[model samples]
Target: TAQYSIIPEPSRTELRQETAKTLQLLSDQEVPTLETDAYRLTVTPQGAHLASGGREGRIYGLATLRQLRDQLAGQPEGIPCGVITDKPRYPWRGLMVDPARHFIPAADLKKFVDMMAYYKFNRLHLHLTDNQGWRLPVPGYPKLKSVASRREESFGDGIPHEGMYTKQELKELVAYCAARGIDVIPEIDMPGHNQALHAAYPEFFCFPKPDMNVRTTAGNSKELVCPQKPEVWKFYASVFNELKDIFPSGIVHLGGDEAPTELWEKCPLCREARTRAAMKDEQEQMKAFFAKTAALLAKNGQTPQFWYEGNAGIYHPGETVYAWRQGQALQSIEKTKKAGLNLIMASSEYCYLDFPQIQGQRNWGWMKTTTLQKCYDLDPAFGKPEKEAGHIRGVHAPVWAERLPDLNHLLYRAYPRACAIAEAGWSPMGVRSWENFRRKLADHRQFILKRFNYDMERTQGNEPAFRWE
Candidate 1:
């Protein structure tokens, strides 16, 4: 027997109760509506029957079926009969992995995707480039792989940290994710997080630094690409031209977050571009910078998305933004709504899996950890009514790898909390209950153990700790 058993199967009587209650709920409470990723799952002694509106719904239905199989793993051939009708509240259920920091291998990523697919997360946001390291190959940019991919040493240690996905590898990863209904969103952070770019081509930088090592530290880099340089535009155009074919999702994440404007204010080229455009200041130039990026992405027929940086004062209309600032999510939501933009909830407090699962676990001094319960508490709309929260798209958990060294570290931080995010994203609002979720999670706990062989440290002083061999 596994240390952590599966969730208890609902009995025949319970199934009838659930079906009648659900039919009643559908009949009486709310107006009948069509849904995209909706499914009807019925388990009987004869066999299991799953009906869905679309192909994606079938994938989710199979996922629920898989969980139920585990729930009845040790039971009789005639499993407890039940019916479960479910659909996601939002479309953009996702998780972001930073391969720039500690390079994750293809095998590890496949395993991660398997878990995400089982949980019904539809998006896998890959942080492909950053100040720390550029993690993918651009066809024209040979230097990106040769120069930007290698770092002197990781965390000041003698050992070097470097890796990049080949064209075949990238395609394979995308195909593997797509088979499971997960759209791979490639985030090639630009203008800011451009130290890696600057390192590769110092001539394009505003204040050219000769010693441009791919940053080994884990904070914001002050350096940025000089937006006014014609070469800069040509370079990104080439990059995007290549990216348009590589990523299938049709959403390009052009990171416009944490960028400082001192370089633009002083650079002669920037001032010239500003004057040519009849702009007043550097911030206006930044607005122009943003507009140019959005235009380029539009050329490729891809939607532009950004990290919500309210302090930066550069926002293009109709672009989607992810709210990651822990305490300021509500403010960002308000601003995103006011600006008529889509808001994705990735509140660091609730959705950052890189933070320690418990208070005393290992993390940076500035970082605050999130308990399992806290991760489960995130509302994509921040408790706003449907009409008021129409602009809110969904939730995403960013498993940032500032200190995470490998898949073990990644799974340790992710598993239980990520399961919570899966439920938060996929389950309808009213269908959720903390106690019920705990039971379901107990089953997933065993699944993770059996599937990945990742032994997650069950917390002390909470509900019973789940374990398996």
Candidate 2:
């Protein structure tokens, strides 16, 4: 029996169980009864959609559902929900959680998946390894989780307690997310963010100040793995071998963005790699570096995706690129198409929802804020590579989890705002307005309240003074 036309489509039996849990929670509230048998329950190929009746009869996108919730923030009363027809604007839309930067508990990540399910988001990119920390559990090399990844460093420049997912843990997480039609893609940031690995296994990567800790407390670290070292790739390849058991995603992200190449100018191993690959510039060297890394994953029958950086010129046709830098996406889209490559445009200008606060302008930088207004502003395919913009797959609001201590901070800053982008992504063209979006946002506070059982007050609205001149 159901209170509304609750249809769970494109989902597995687990989702059906999850909906039942939601209904149970609603029942526990002990409010008015709408009669469980009042409406029919059905399962379709595309799963279920729980939403109010508006903006086209029962089909509540992430934006509308929250809006309806906030409208009743003060009341625990039931507002009957009817029908819904919702899916993603693009199949690959996602948000990235950098657990390597700081350990995000399994329960926390599962909450993230639940939220994504509500939004009909289909992917979650887990940044499992970075220069600062390692968040993936590779059993053969116990060092990956213990020596390389685990560390409770001073304060929170990185992980609170070094934690990595075991094979079983990853499989569990993957299965949990798959229940909601969400694919959890793991990114093993290589070449660049190799500090943690460098910290323990100096031979595994190229480090100038090898004795010194390379993790960034606040700024940058240029020490990258020696791409020339065949053993380096072999060592990581073995790691990937174990990874196959954990994630079943077709693509493995080899983060190539922001690889400060200054080390290549100095390191003998890096110089040897450039010479071996016949690489004229640092960019060509990276092209080869990525090629080899991609080969390792390809051996396991996985396609490779990477972030676009200064090496955009060398991206191959089979690769998928995400341009994260601000306005640079306009150029990346053109370059990606001209190079005959598929692309996912998540430029910070449009999707960096974790842009730091401006209260005292502490972490604020030149290329930070993708303000609420800006989130709805960019067209994923706006600057057409060809009049078609066919190479551009879609848009995504990247809820960068770095700097965010945990999922709570991740949501407090991320939500409502991210919902804005979700609407921009899912709502049909010209079907939404900023004013309407903002007003709708005010209403969704109640749903969040119901879920978290916590009151959310808007930020301080603090203004910080700056002198540009």
Scored by TM-score, the top model is 1
Name the TM-score of candidate 1: 0.90
Candidate 2: deviation at residue 30, Å?
34
lDDT of 2 by residue, 1-469 (tens): 2222111121111123222112211211111232221112222223323432232222223333443344334444433433433443444667787787767888888887776666556678888887668877665566676566755553443334567776777888999987666778888887877778877677766654557453645356687788767768778787788768778886788887678888876777778767776778777777777887887888898878888883556677767888777667777777777788888878786678667433323243543544567676766777354465677766666665445666777776666556665665555444456766665455445555676664444553522222221
Per residue, candidate 1 scores C-alpha lDDT tens digits across 1-469 of 1121222111111253211111111211121342446666665555666666777766776777666666565343324556667777788899999998878999999998998887788999999888878987877779999989888876666567889998788889889998999999988887788777778888778888877888877788878788867888888888788778888888888878788788788888778888888989867877778888888888989788888877435776677889998689888877888888888889888998988787766656777878888888877787888877888889999998867778877877887888788878766667666777776676566666676676554664342222211
Per-model CA lDDT versus the true structure: 0.75, 0.62
- TM-score, per-candidate, Cα-based: 0.90, 0.78
Model 2 local distance difference test score: 0.62
Name the candidate that leads on lDDT: 1
